Amino acid sequence: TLFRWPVRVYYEDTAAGGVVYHASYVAFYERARTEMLRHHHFSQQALMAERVAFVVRKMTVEYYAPARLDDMLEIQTEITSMRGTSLVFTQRIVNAENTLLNEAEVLVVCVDPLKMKPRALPKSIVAEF
Amino acid sequence: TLFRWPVRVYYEDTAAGGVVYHASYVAFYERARTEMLRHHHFSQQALMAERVAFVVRKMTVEYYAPARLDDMLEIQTEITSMRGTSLVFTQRIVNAENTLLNEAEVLVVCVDPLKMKPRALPKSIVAEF
Amino acid sequence: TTLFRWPVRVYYEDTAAGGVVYHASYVAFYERARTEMLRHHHFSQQALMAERVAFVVRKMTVEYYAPARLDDMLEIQTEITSMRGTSLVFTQRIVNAENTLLNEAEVLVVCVDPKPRALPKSIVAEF
Amino acid sequence: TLFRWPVRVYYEDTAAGGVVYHASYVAFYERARTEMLRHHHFSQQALMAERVAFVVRKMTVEYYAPARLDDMLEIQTEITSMRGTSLVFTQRIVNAENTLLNEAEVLVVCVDPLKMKPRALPKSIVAEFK
Numbered sequence: 001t002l003f004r005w006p007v008r009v010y011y012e013d014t015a016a017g018g019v020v021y022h023a024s025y026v027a028f029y030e031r032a033r034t035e036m037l038r039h040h041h042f043s044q045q046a047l048m049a050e051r052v053a054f055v056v057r058k059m060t061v062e063y064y065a066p067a068r069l070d071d072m073l074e075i076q077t078e079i080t081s082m083r084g085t086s087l088v089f090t091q092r093i094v095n096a097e098n099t100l101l102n103e104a105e106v107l108v109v110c111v112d113p114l115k116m117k118p119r120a121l122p123k124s125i126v127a128e129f
Numbered sequence: 130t131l132f133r134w135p136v137r138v139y140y141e142d143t144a145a146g147g148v149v150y151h152a153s154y155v156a157f158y159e160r161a162r163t164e165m166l167r168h169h170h171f172s173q174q175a176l177m178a179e180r181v182a183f184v185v186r187k188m189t190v191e192y193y194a195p196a197r198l199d200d201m202l203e204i205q206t207e208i209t210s211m212r213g214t215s216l217v218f219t220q221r222i223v224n225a226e227n228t229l230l231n232e233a234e235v236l237v238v239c240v241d242p243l244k245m246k247p248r249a250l251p252k253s254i255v256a257e258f
Numbered sequence: 259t260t261l262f263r264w265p266v267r268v269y270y271e272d273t274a275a276g277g278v279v280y281h282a283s284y285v286a287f288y289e290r291a292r293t294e295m296l297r298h299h300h301f302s303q304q305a306l307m308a309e310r311v312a313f314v315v316r317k318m319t320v321e322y323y324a325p326a327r328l329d330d331m332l333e334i335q336t337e338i339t340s341m342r343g344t345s346l347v348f349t350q351r352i353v354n355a356e357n358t359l360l361n362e363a364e365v366l367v368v369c370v371d372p373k374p375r376a377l378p379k380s381i382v383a384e385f
Numbered sequence: 386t387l388f389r390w391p392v393r394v395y396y397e398d399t400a401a402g403g404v405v406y407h408a409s410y411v412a413f414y415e416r417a418r419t420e421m422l423r424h425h426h427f428s429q430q431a432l433m434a435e436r437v438a439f440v441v442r443k444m445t446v447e448y449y450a451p452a453r454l455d456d457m458l459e460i461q462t463e464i465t466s467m468r469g470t471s472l473v474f475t476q477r478i479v480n481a482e483n484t485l486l487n488e489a490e491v492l493v494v495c496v497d498p499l500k501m502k503p504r505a506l507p508k509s510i511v512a513e514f515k
């Protein structure tokens with residue numbers, strides 16, 4: 001089920017061309033994943049209490065049009081796949097005119113932050129999604 | 130042919146998990162492509178002179194193992210495909226023990242800096258690579 | 259008075275390997291708050307673009323009293339405490355959810371032509 | 386006893402105004418302090434494992450002139466005070482033509498990172514910087 005997250009573009013996100021730096025979008029996507037989990041009570045507390053961390057294993061981003069300084073964006077996020085130890089997030093960013101700026105597909109793996117090796121998906125997360 | 134670029138990991142690149150933040154690698158890869166171009170005399174000055182800029186159209190990043198604070202990394206970069214308006218860079222990151230940490234494939238489009246619309250690769254770029 | 263409040267959530271991108279917010283991240287947080295304060299007083303950046311005005315930091319002093327951490331919801335507090343000629347001073351501080359004072363800053367900002375120009379009369383009148 | 390460190394300005398460091406973002410200089414200064422420690426044989430990743438870390442307690446930065454894309458900068462760094470738990474770094478940034486761009490003064494405090502509580506500077510670090 002879709003989760004929406006608003007993001008304002010600030011000077012820090014821009015680059016010399018007047019557009020958002022392409023790596024800043026990657027950070028925006030991470031914020032939206034974090035907020036989606038937070039919304040489902042999967043805070044860092046609840047995660048690291050039942051043995052977890054989440055790390056990015058593979059990420060594909062396709063860039064169509066730029067965001068500019070002071071734009072108000074919407075990050076849209078869905079969990080489209082769940083396996084043994086991993087989830088796939090399907091994400092995209094639109095601007096206030098609903099113009100599609102870029103899209104991402106993010107494979108995420110559940111690990112142990114001390115040693116960082118694949119841990120099975122907690123059943124709480126599987127049932128929640 | 131392979132272009133090698135060293136990158137040191139600083140606090141600004143790390144996050145609270147104690148490893149490099151996944152978006153930081155995207156910036157590392159960009160620096161290596163910039164320095165690869167610079168090695169062939171395609172500086173920012175030479176590119177502006179021939180009315181050319183490069184933008185990332187699509188990027189896939191594979192995260193195998195973490196970099197940490199104080200690691201001296203080597204980014205390895207090769208141009209593996211050259212189309213009419215487009216270049217594909219294949220890149221990878223190893224640490225000082227030559228452990229493969231990370232790999233990327235980057236589709237880069239040639240645009241004019243005025244309209245940001247695609248344009249044919251400069252003949253010098255085609256001839257050089 | 260001019261006191262403006264702005265919330266900021268701490269994300270992974272803001273943290274560093276020590277487990278706390280990287281010290282340069284606070285500098286960005288303070289800039290967002292100045293930007294939003296100006297938006298609240300009807301000086302969005304596209305409006306400022308139309309009046310030929312930009313703002314650049316000339317000098318800043320930051321005091322780091324206690325750290326912010328991943329997932330903290332912070333409040334940036336911002337006041338314009340002086341204005342004269344071409345420049346103005348922002349006084350800013352950051353508190354966490356317990357109202358612990360984490361940080362404070364004094365920022366000298368100069369109005370420029372996107373070179374130093376006098377403050378707009380509307381900006382001075384507003385503050 | 387100055388320590389010099391070069392830094393190339395990349396597209397990631399620029400902002401919409403065409404110049405380096407004012408917070409990027411702050412990161413440049415941190416890199417130079419880290420490299421000064423590294424030149425004197427100290428690794429902050431290794432020190433972390435010994436429950437030793439350094440945090441910024443106070444910083445002043447003055448911006449005189451901008452850096453731009455592809456500039457090769459030199460960060461210049463000295464330790465000007467050292468006592469108890471703390472060090473003062475005095476730093477500046479010049480460009481390739483030796484134009485003074487930026488200056489900073491940074492009060493740094495040694496802490497146990499587990500508790501984020503100050504501690505005496507390591508004896509070997511004191512020995513190293515006089």
Ligand SMILES: CCCCCC(=O)SCCNC(=O)CCNC(=O)[C@H](O)C(C)(C)COP(=O)(O)OP(=O)(O)OC[C@H]1O[C@@H](n2cnc3c(N)ncnc32)[C@H](O)[C@@H]1OP(=O)(O)O
Binds near residue numbers: 274322324358498
């Ligand atoms: C390590 C990874 C990061 C790498 C480098 C970075 O980016 S560094 C990240 C940015 N820097 C920081 O986060 C440092 C934050 N500062 C601190 O944690 C602490 O100030 C610190 C141990 C240096 C110093 O603590 P001290 O109390 O011994 O020093 P000092 O007396 O000067 O502190 C001034 C005021 O701050 C208060 N104070 C100190 N620690 C506090 C805390 N944890 N929670 C609430 N208040 C605190 C003091 O009691 C005092 O309050 P009163 O004046 O009201 O009596």
